[PDB]
Amino acid sequence: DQICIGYHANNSTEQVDTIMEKNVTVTHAQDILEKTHNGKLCDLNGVKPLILKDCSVAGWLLGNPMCDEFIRVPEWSYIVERANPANDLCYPGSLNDYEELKHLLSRINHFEKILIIPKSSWPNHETSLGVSAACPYQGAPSFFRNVVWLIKKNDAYPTIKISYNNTNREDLLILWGIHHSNNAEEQTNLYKNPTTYISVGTSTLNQRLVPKIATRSQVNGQRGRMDFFWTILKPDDAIHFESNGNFIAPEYAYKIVKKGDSTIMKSGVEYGHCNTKCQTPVGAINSSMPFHNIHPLTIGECPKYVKSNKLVLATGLRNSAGFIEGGWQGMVDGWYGYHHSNEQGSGYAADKESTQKAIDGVTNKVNSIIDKMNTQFEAVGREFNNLERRIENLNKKMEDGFLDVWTYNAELLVLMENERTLDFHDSNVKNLYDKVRLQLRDNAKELGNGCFEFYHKCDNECMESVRNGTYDYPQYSEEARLKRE
Amino acid sequence: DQICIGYHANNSTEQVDTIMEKNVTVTHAQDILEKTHNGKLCDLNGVKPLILKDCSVAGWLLGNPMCDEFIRVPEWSYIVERANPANDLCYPGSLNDYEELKHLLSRINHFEKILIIPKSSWPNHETSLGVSAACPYQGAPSFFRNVVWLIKKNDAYPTIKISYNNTNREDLLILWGIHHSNNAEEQTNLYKNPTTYISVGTSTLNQRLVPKIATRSQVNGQRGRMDFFWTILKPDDAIHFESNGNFIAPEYAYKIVKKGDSTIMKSGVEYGHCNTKCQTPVGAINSSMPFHNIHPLTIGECPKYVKSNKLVLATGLRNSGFIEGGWQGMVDGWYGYHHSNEQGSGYAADKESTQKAIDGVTNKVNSIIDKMNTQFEAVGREFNNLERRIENLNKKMEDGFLDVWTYNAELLVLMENERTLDFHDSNVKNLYDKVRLQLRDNAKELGNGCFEFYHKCDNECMESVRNGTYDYPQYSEEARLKRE
Amino acid sequence: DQICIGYHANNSTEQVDTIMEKNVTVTHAQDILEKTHNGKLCDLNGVKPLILKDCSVAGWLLGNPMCDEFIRVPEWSYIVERANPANDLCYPGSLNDYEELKHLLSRINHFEKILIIPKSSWPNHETSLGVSAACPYQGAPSFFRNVVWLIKKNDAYPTIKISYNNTNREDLLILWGIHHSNNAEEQTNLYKNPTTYISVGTSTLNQRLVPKIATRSQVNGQRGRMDFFWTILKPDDAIHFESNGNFIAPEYAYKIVKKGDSTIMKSGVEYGHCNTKCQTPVGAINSSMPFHNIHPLTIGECPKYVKSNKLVLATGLRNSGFIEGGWQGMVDGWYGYHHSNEQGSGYAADKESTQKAIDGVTNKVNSIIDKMNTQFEAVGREFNNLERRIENLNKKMEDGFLDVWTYNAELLVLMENERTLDFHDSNVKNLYDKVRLQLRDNAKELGNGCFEFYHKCDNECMESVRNGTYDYPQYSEEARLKRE
Numbered sequence A: 001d002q003i004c005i006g007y008h009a010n011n012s013t014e015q016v017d018t019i020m021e022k023n024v025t026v027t028h029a030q031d032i033l034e035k036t037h038n039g040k041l042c043d044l045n046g047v048k049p050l051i052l053k054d055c056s057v058a059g060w061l062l063g064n065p066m067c068d069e070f071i072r073v074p075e076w077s078y079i080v081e082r083a084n085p086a087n088d089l090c091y092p093g094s095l096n097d098y099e100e101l102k103h104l105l106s107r108i109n110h111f112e113k114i115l116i117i118p119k120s121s122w123p124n125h126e127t128s129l130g131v132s133a134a135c136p137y138q139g140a141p142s143f144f145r146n147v148v149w150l151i152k153k154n155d156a157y158p159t160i161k162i163s164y165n166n167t168n169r170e171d172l173l174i175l176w177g178i179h180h181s182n183n184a185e186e187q188t189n190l191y192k193n194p195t196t197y198i199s200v201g202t203s204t205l206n207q208r209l210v211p212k213i214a215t216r217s218q219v220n221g222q223r224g225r226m227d228f229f230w231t232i233l234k235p236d237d238a239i240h241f242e243s244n245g246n247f248i249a250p251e252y253a254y255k256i257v258k259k260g261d262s263t264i265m266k267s268g269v270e271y272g273h274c275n276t277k278c279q280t281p282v283g284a285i286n287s288s289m290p291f292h293n294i295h296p297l298t299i300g301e302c303p304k305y306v307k308s309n310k311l312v313l314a315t316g317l318r319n320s321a322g323f324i325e326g327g328w329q330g331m332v333d334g335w336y337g338y339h340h341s342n343e344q345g346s347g348y349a350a351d352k353e354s355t356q357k358a359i360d361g362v363t364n365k366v367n368s369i370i371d372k373m374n375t376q377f378e379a380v381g382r383e384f385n386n387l388e389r390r391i392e393n394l395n396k397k398m399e400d401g402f403l404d405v406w407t408y409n410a411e412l413l414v415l416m417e418n419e420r421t422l423d424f425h426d427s428n429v430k431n432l433y434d435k436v437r438l439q440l441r442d443n444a445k446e447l448g449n450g451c452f453e454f455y456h457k458c459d460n461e462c463m464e465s466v467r468n469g470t471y472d473y474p475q476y477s478e479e480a481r482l483k484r485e
Numbered sequence B, C: 001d002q003i004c005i006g007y008h009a010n011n012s013t014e015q016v017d018t019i020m021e022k023n024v025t026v027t028h029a030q031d032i033l034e035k036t037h038n039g040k041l042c043d044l045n046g047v048k049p050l051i052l053k054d055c056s057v058a059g060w061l062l063g064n065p066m067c068d069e070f071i072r073v074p075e076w077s078y079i080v081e082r083a084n085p086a087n088d089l090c091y092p093g094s095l096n097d098y099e100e101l102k103h104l105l106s107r108i109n110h111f112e113k114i115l116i117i118p119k120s121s122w123p124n125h126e127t128s129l130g131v132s133a134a135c136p137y138q139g140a141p142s143f144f145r146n147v148v149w150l151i152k153k154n155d156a157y158p159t160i161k162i163s164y165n166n167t168n169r170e171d172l173l174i175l176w177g178i179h180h181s182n183n184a185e186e187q188t189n190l191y192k193n194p195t196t197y198i199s200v201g202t203s204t205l206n207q208r209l210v211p212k213i214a215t216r217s218q219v220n221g222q223r224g225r226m227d228f229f230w231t232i233l234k235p236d237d238a239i240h241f242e243s244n245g246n247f248i249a250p251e252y253a254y255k256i257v258k259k260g261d262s263t264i265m266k267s268g269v270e271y272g273h274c275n276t277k278c279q280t281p282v283g284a285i286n287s288s289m290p291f292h293n294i295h296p297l298t299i300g301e302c303p304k305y306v307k308s309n310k311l312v313l314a315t316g317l318r319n320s321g322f323i324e325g326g327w328q329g330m331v332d333g334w335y336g337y338h339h340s341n342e343q344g345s346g347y348a349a350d351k352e353s354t355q356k357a358i359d360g361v362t363n364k365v366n367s368i369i370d371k372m373n374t375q376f377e378a379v380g381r382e383f384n385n386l387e388r389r390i391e392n393l394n395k396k397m398e399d400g401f402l403d404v405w406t407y408n409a410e411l412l413v414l415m416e417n418e419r420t421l422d423f424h425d426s427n428v429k430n431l432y433d434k435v436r437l438q439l440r441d442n443a444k445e446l447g448n449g450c451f452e453f454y455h456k457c458d459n460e461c462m463e464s465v466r467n468g469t470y471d472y473p474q475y476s477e478e479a480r481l482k483r484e
């Protein structure tokens, strides 16, 4: 007749690795790595992205004829540009500080196109003949919609002096430009004056733009260039333009309210009509998990990116070395338990108030690991041009350096803490074995099989008494002494 | 008679968290995070900062007539500016590469102003009428002091050619400027020449400045602009100027000796006459702790910034077995003995086990604290309105380090608090098993962490249990008779 | 007569630290810090570096007469420059975006010089008279090899109009320049037109360079300057030039194909005809270790730089318990027994317990090593003197990761070293308990980790305890008679 102390077992094929042991098969386990994404672009904390479809920020702002998605997205959380946007700056040219404009325009609380300078304001200039084939609507010469290309009237280009005073109590992104002619004849056939200039003036702005007339290669059919510039006119300031020619003048402008920053996501996944806290270029994540293996370029309150394919914590115990050779599959109601063998019956009876302390403790470990990184911050990817490659490497080295920090720390944490969990189970069961012993030492033989050879025949009642620690060895003393000497 | 094994307890309400348990009351604790700061701007490693009051670096450098208060301080460690300096450039304009000059001048080991180009070097030119309302000394029209605004003399502005050969064995910060007019009438009225230029050339510098005459909105009453430029002249180089107008000419210059760098601190906190190794915009830290939560924009050998409000390490044993009782009566050691015999009762601590634990617990805390080995660096924010991308790259960096340090500092505390509390438990068990091995069968293992002496033990054999000098033969027969 | 439980000891003087215990001498150890290099510059993953001996990238790209080691390498993994290169721009001047060109040229998969504008293309200009004493070759005036300094012919400089269509299926790096003359007399002597220009135009380039005729300081004996500009002409694009004068015309251009990035290294070390995955300026690393203390500025897949001088993990046994005592005589194992009987005294080891430990501590060391992500390709970057703020940003990042990696590594060693020692203590105690249950009421627990056999035990009887097959009945009555 004997009683034994044991640990739970099940059908789990789940494996965890530890610092000193690999491919340990455990009963229960929880992966702290989120590997799933919805596959759709979604809203970020309630606000909808500005999905410029085959358009660029420059083409959308200046008003490329081919771009016809609604300018009326009043607020956005991030801009979604396709990589290599199809339609951008139809007339060959540039936009100064495109990348800084895009950054400002990444998250905008209020975007309202207003007309600041009417086409009626150019009485001595022609507003209808500033078109090019390169910028084409329905197979006809057209131009940028929100900017005007002014040419001569009656072989004359009288000097322009104009001003717009922002009266709107809201900042204004005003876009203007210069046309670079290809020859002196082209200069005198669109403008009339040979030497030209553009002056732009605000409180912060002093500009002098002179055309560069020289032979250039042809892009989109034209050997001339249009270089655009921008400023943010403050609530009560005036912008002053002066030109004797070569002026792509502002007609429309944009009201800007700037509160918060984001990035331009480059992706092709469709808007899924959803909301998320974390947005990847390939999908969106809904998770409290601490780490993720999806995409480096994430926007929102996102998990930390690591290179791991799996990060399996151990929420349970081993499946079938120590004094207790194996696990009892038949035990169902507890992790730690007793086995009573006597004449009345032999069965498995688990010990709660030991399993319960274990399940709460291991659960708190998992939750402490998951929640103590509530350091989740708003973060984004970035964009740098082809003459900022050195700054790009700083970004790559920072992003890669943080990756290697988390990947090493996370895996070691999993390996270190999983070992402690498995030994915490081995320590917990010995405390049950030691509690049963030290209460019946003389009456049973410590076989070391995890079992005690009960010299005294114990009924089902003293089994529960041993479980409750209420075994009186005087009550059962001599029946064991007869088997003893 | 019986002898008991147990641990110490006290009045402390200090609570610590482990990775597996929360709100665990312990006898002693240690927070490894610093929340206390001086509340004053102290000197950094012996050097007093350059506190500019309602002054910007540009206004202090160029000589804003309202900014001349801090003219003679030979060296400094960091520059203190208010968030919105009120004086700055009286005549509207700019200073090229301002934020790089600010960085260069954040830590200077020698600054001295010298007269490089006297006002007597400008005959045939006028040194007296270059004054504006925007720059005001005692309500009177004035202008920047360290630079000169030359204007025409006798309705003529002769082209001037001037050179300065630095001879001072130290580098010279030379500033100069161009005045952008507003109309052709303003130009001729100030400099008879209509088309103008400023050529500036050193060994490293080739500069051509031509004025931008155009209408602009007004600020500080003037619609014109003064764009300023600077260069560092190496100790045996010369700077060569040439202009036919619009030349804001250097009069004074500064000897620079830069042997290190810091940043500009934006703060209005008063100057306390103190010394510190770590300074924040809100105060100074002299802690040796690894982590801190005072301010992000620290400057110096500072702890690591974390988002925690508390980081409490367990240095005690009150909570977290079959010995589940903590003796509040024991007042001399962490682990100890309790003897109950017919002679009396008493508490006595195991000094060996207690001191071994104390020195080990103190090493665990000292390991975490002293292994940090922080480096010196400054965390100022020094990027302009068209440099926002670099500004975010700094933000993601210093926020990415926040998340690394906070997550690791928190778990380190949780992880090592568990080991500490189980270190205490196992140290208790070692005392129990020590006592058990001596009393093989001469006493009964009660199971509550105590032993029931079968024989009778006086106070001196109780001391034999403490000293490991218990004689099993002496009480063996007496105890054997006690059984049955 | 007695059997015992203990651990192995040797001559090892290796000292490690734990979180609670300092300077503990162990039997076996392993340092996870790499502290050695080969002292030579090696190939990076099978690709030779471009070693510009006392040459700058400008002096090699432009044809400095003394730097003109024409390319023998079609590709390179990184560029090795000296700290202060000695040749560079012989005629004083500048190269636009020099630091970004050095990033692009830092790793090149294929590089081939080609003649794009033959000197036969200039029939109305003098291609032979453009030399200077600033650029000397073999005692004679020379100039840059890969560019032509066109001057006037027959007191006439007709406006230049030239175009080069790229037809090479590869991108072309083209370099041109502008000469800044010192006076109007010099301008009319070398060129004839007094007001000049240089227009350069591709699909992505619109440029207008005008000379800066002004007095400058004398560098390399010349007060003139030559400012060079570069572009990358895409495979089916044309560059267009137009110059009134002051034109330093492209003669030779370079084919560029670019597939990776790898910084420029400043080292005086000599090439060693070797290959590595990790390179430092001091030497090259051949390590699988997680961390290193060799040089901050590495290139390749490298361990992590830290400030530590040693990161010694413990794989041994000594001086971790109350089964204390080390047996120097117990070779051939880590855990085992000491048998003392009339037949003699000897040691024996528990093979299964020892092997389970050496495999456990081996995995611990290999887990700390293998979980390292072997980084990526790496760099030490370079910024110029008006970019000191970004340098500070790069400094903060590199120094920030140091403090992160050092602290995490050091404390990881301290934490895992404690439990490695406690792993041995608990494994020894498990052998003690295994023997005690076989020796039930046949010996007495002395408490020092040794069992005094009540009966008399043979040599083979001792072996039965190790074997796990000790018959309590066979020696039952003898021990009862020895217990009085």
Ligand SMILES: *[C@@H]1O[C@H](CO)[C@@H](O)[C@H](O)[C@H]1NC(C)=O
Pocket (backbone or CB within 6 Å): A022, A023
């Ligand atoms: C652990 O299991 C995986 C999956 O079968 C296997 O790839 C790996 O080799 C195993 N680890 C060891 C040490 O055998």
Ligand SMILES: *[C@@H]1O[C@H](CO)[C@@H](O)[C@H](O)[C@H]1NC(C)=O
Pocket (backbone or CB within 6 Å): B022, B023
């Ligand atoms: C711990 O203590 C604080 C203060 O009483 C209490 O608000 C908090 O709920 C407690 N946390 C837990 C898990 O009991």
Ligand SMILES: *[C@@H]1O[C@H](CO)[C@@H](O)[C@H](O)[C@H]1NC(C)=O
Pocket (backbone or CB within 6 Å): A165, A166, A236, A237, A238, B217, B218
């Ligand atoms: C624009 O209008 C406001 C109205 O108060 C006026 O103060 C201002 O002078 C104008 N701003 C200019 C010319 O900068």
Ligand SMILES: *[C@@H]1O[C@H](CO)[C@@H](O)[C@H](O)[C@H]1NC(C)=O
Pocket (backbone or CB within 6 Å): B165, B166, B236, B237, B238, C217, C218
């Ligand atoms: C300045 O004076 C010294 C006197 O020896 C002279 O060598 C040096 O050339 C001068 N510097 C310049 C730029 O002329």
Ligand SMILES: *[C@@H]1O[C@H](CO)[C@@H](O)[C@H](O)[C@H]1NC(C)=O
Pocket (backbone or CB within 6 Å): C010, C011, C012, C331
């Ligand atoms: C130290 O002990 C080992 C065997 O344990 C032996 O091989 C080695 O030679 C000894 N080292 C020295 C310096 O004596």
Ligand SMILES: *[C@@H]1O[C@H](CO)[C@@H](O)[C@H](O)[C@H]1NC(C)=O
Pocket (backbone or CB within 6 Å): C022, C023
């Ligand atoms: C540990 O060993 C080193 C080298 O012998 C010694 O400098 C140091 O003082 C020792 N540490 C302590 C706490 O004794």
Ligand SMILES: *[C@@H]1O[C@H](CO)[C@@H](O)[C@H](O)[C@H]1NC(C)=O
Pocket (backbone or CB within 6 Å): A217, A218, C165, C166, C236, C237, C238
């Ligand atoms: C260059 O050559 C090809 C083939 O003749 C031609 O199609 C192309 O237009 C040329 N490009 C330029 C910019 O001249």
